[PDB]
Amino acid sequence: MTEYKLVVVGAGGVGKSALTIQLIQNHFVDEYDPTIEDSYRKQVVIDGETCLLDILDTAAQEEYSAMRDQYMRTGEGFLCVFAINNTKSFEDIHQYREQIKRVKDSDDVPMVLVGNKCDLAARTVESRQAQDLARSYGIPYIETSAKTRQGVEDAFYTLVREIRQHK
Ligand SMILES: Nc1nc2c(ncn2[C@@H]2O[C@H](COP(=O)(O)OP(=O)(O)NP(=O)(O)O)[C@@H](O)[C@H]2O)c(=O)[nH]1
Numbered sequence: 001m002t003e004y005k006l007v008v009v010g011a012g013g014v015g016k017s018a019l020t021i022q023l024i025q026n027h028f029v030d031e032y033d034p035t036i037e038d039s040y041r042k043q044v045v046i047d048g049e050t051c052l053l054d055i056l057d058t059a060a061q062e063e064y065s066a067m068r069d070q071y072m073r074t075g076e077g078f079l080c081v082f083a084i085n086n087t088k089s090f091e092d093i094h095q096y097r098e099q100i101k102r103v104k105d106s107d108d109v110p111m112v113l114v115g116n117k118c119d120l121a122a123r124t125v126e127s128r129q130a131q132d133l134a135r136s137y138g139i140p141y142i143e144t145s146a147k148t149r150q151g152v153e154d155a156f157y158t159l160v161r162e163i164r165q166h167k
């Protein structure tokens with residue numbers, strides 16, 4: 001069946017790991033501690049088709065990762081995550097996108113912009129601002145909470161559909 005290589009990127013603390021674990025966790029382990037970069041597998045049916053998702057949870061740009069360029073080459077679609085209470089993380093999206101362009105040599109790489117931590121009242125990035133940004137790149141914008149689980153499935157499955165539509 002169809003395998004998708006997905007990569008989760010973004011600034012430190014935005015919830016890259018929390019999102020990934022929320023999607024892929026089977027709850028055998030009650031609380032799972034993800035301190036390192038790692039890969040995780042999830043089998044899912046999307047629009048009638050059984051997909052195997054291979055999901056790479058990455059470190060922020062400021063962290064050293066030897067395989068960084070290679071996993072961006074491998075990656076077929078990217079969740080570009082910022083937190084709605086962290087303006088710097090939203091501003092850093094430009095840099096994550098540029099890194100993906102640098103490696104893959106394309107302006108048309110499948111991506112979804114994800115405003116995480118939407119359960120929090122203390123918002124500093126308005127949804128309209130992020131919609132405008134996503135529209136300028138021709139990518140979807142999805143808000144999520146890794147805590148309440150709102151939007152998590154939508155974010156990842158939307159990314160899969162972007163990859164499929166890119167073909
Ligand atoms: N309120 C709230 N907190 C969240 C949400 N997602 C993650 N967090 C919290 O934000 C902190 C960072 O989460 P984490 O999953 O480690 O983020 P990360 O982007 O993987 N961090 P790192 O870059 O260090 O790997 C944790 O305290 C986590 O519980 C969310 O949707 N809502």
Ligand SMILES: [Mg+2]
Pocket residue numbers: 016017018034035057058
């Ligand atoms: Mg993490």
Ligand SMILES: [Mg+2]
Pocket residue numbers: 123
């Ligand atoms: Mg406000």
